[PDB]
RNA sequence: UAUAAUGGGUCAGCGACUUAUAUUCAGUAGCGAGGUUAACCGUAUAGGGGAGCCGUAGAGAAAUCGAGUCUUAAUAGGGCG
RNA sequence: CCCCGAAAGCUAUUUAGGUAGCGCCUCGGACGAAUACCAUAGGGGGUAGAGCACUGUUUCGGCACCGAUGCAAACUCCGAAUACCUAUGAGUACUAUCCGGGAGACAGACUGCGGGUGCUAACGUCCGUAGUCAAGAGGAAAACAAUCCAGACCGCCAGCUAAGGCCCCAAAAUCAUAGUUAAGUGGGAAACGAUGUGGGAAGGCAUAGACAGCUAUAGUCGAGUCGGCCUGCGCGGAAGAUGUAACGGGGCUAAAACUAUGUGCCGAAGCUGCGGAUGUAUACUUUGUAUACGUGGUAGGGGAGCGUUCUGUAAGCCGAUGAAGGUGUGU
RNA sequence: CGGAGGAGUACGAAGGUGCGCUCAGCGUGGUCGGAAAUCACGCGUAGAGUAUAAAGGCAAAAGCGCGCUUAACUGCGAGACCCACAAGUCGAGCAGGUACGAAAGUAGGUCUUAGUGAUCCGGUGGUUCUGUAUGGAAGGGCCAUCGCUCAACGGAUAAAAGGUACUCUGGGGAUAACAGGCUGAUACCGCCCAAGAGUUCAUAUCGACGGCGGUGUUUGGCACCUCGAUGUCGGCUCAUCUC
RNA sequence: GCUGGCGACCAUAGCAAGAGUGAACCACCUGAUCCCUUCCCGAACUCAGAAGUGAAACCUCUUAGCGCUGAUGGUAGUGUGGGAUUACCCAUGUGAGAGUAAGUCAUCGCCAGCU
């Protein structure tokens, strides 16, 4: 008998809008365990690492700033 | 202006993709010849098909 | 499944999606913001019988209001209309 | 009789060969480019590969460190092709979406590719992805669901091709030009062994005389000789039980084998030709007409009909100058 | 029924805020004192830490201290993620009342992802709801909250173990025991290399450490045929083939 | 041309070594009376000032030492079609990582002082 055989449900992470798409106050960008990406600019973060945009506009990804950290931003 | 294009095979086994590369280029039988505006565009869907299709250019 | 998997020795006759009630949807006919009677009476498929049923208004657990209503301290916001 | 046409998945279940919601099929209504294929533009990645900068692991030196050198699904200083999301656009196509009536199905199989497990076993087992069967006929595979070619509306004693073939069984070249093989290799297999034969690139010795043989390094003779590397096709290794039985058979050797090139032909229910039927749509602004595109199908869904018994039409019509029934023939 | 680990909690501060601060390791000296307690100066360097397993993160540190405090608030909530349902997740912003800041401001528990249980039936607090003639009341509704290892964790009952060789029915070759089939780990047979043994001498005869095959007599693996029946361990009689 | 503040950018821009700067600016500097401060300490934070020094620090310049950037070509991988099954070959498209040549001691913006 293997003393294996566990797993947990999963949870469907990742990038939810990709650069270039238009987005509305509210929408999600990016789910994530950590910060794999930071917000920049029109860009909101959440009690769980969730990225979301708090205008309309444009959705970018950059790197940036002098530890080359990942943005993503909302251009109006 | 316009290129021939027959078709030389059958298309009732390949990818979904490449039977829709033949269906946008109205091919609908072997041995079935079109003419197409040359544009890159309907380059790109003969391309895809090379194998299975002739151009008369 | 040729299968060495099942069933049939052969013929003739019989042998299996029905009936009642309710409900929903579709066709078709009458009437139409209206439609329709049930039991019953009736020398009786007629003609009477309007009790009742469906439609015509929603919101709310409810009291209550009503083109609004519920929640709320709120004429804010939001949900059903 | 006509049209369309699945699934063997996900989730839950005293559930596992049942059932329910969703996914997939069909019919009606609404609504038309909102859809797809391809091009261009924008975007995130941590796989293949690779690497040692972290985590582990490995060998050899020098003094845990320094210099060389390997490895990794649960390592990463790096890092594609594809795939996925969005916007714009040409051409092509009955696309996409919404609201309802009816389902079936929730035992899959093989093959290729990426993997886990297993012994890099199994016509094994479990996933992802594509094709076929399932539910699909025809031709090639000797025979052979799942391989290759190809998707059967009906008829023809017409033609062109695909896969695969062209000496006879058996349709079409005893076709053409260059080579290779001698093993019936072709028409089953390994480590390994060998002066079998074809081709190629180098190296050594040699007519002031080479190799072998032969006489006591010299000497007779009279040109090549020697040892390796790469490569084409062959040889041994190779033992089983009903009967040749490991080209389907006959048979095949300047092939009817293999390699390369060329010109023809055969070959399917594919394509074309002629005749006929049927479904959908556009225009003819009734028509029943032309054009364009369709017509393989299990579970299922939709549409249209044939015959049988009985009631009205029917106190009608047919019938002993012969009804029903039975048995032939024609159409 | 593949390879490895964790959970069924904890915390009124380990929450909020304002201000402030950087770890770990090594080397030099310094009483007990050293391998390693505390002090001081350097060197190079995220290798420390983050209540807890791992992963993704962590300089405006999300790590570490101090003062004041209760936003571990009430009514909500544009818009999204995920999704068969039932559920689950993120959230700017508006109003009221607060805490900390001089202030711009920050705060709807904790770096995040586990720490959980539907419905029914009952208990407790509240309630400008209902109240079977009427006024009350009992009971019911609404809001908040309590009682599960229902852990077989979508939970069939509030409540449940065994035997059958005395047995029976409906089914399955969807699924085992025999024989067949695929496979060949195992089994049996053969070959390659050759340390050595053989008084010298690998190969007369053996042959270590290793390598490559064949067969389909063993033990097995799989579950393709047969469960509307393929009905046998040995003996007897009679055989036929392989080398 | 020098100095200060705030930004863009985040190593071709960084580290290391060497050398320079005092008019103004900045930095050390005086001590601790009132503000304020140290789980001790005027070390930091804070106040009130210029007797000294550019020593340290910070800035500026030089150096390819460490580091960083980095072609071209080839190789690996890979979508589609075909041929094979130790995982290759062909046609077509795509194309790393490592390494080699080579490069680098940054480049801009706003405001204010001193010549």
Do not use: W
């Amino acid at each position: 008998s293997t003393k294996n055989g566990r797993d947990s449900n999963p949870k469907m992470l990742g990038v939810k809008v990709y650069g270039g798409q238009t987005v509305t106050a509210g929408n999600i960008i990016v789910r994530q365990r950590g910060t794999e990406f930071h917000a920049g600019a029109n860009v909101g973060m959440g009690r769980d690492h969730t990225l979301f945009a708090t205008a309309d506009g444009v959705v970018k990804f950059e790197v940036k700033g002098q530890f080359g950290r990942r943005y993503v931003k909302v251009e109006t | 202006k316009t290129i021939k294009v027959t078709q030389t095979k059958s298309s009732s086994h390949r990818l979904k993709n490449h039977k829709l590369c033949l269906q946008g280029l109205g091919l609908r039988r072997i041995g079935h010849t079109v003419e197409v505006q040359d544009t890159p565009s309907n380059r790109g869907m003969i391309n895809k098909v090379y194998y299975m299709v002739s151009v008369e250019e």
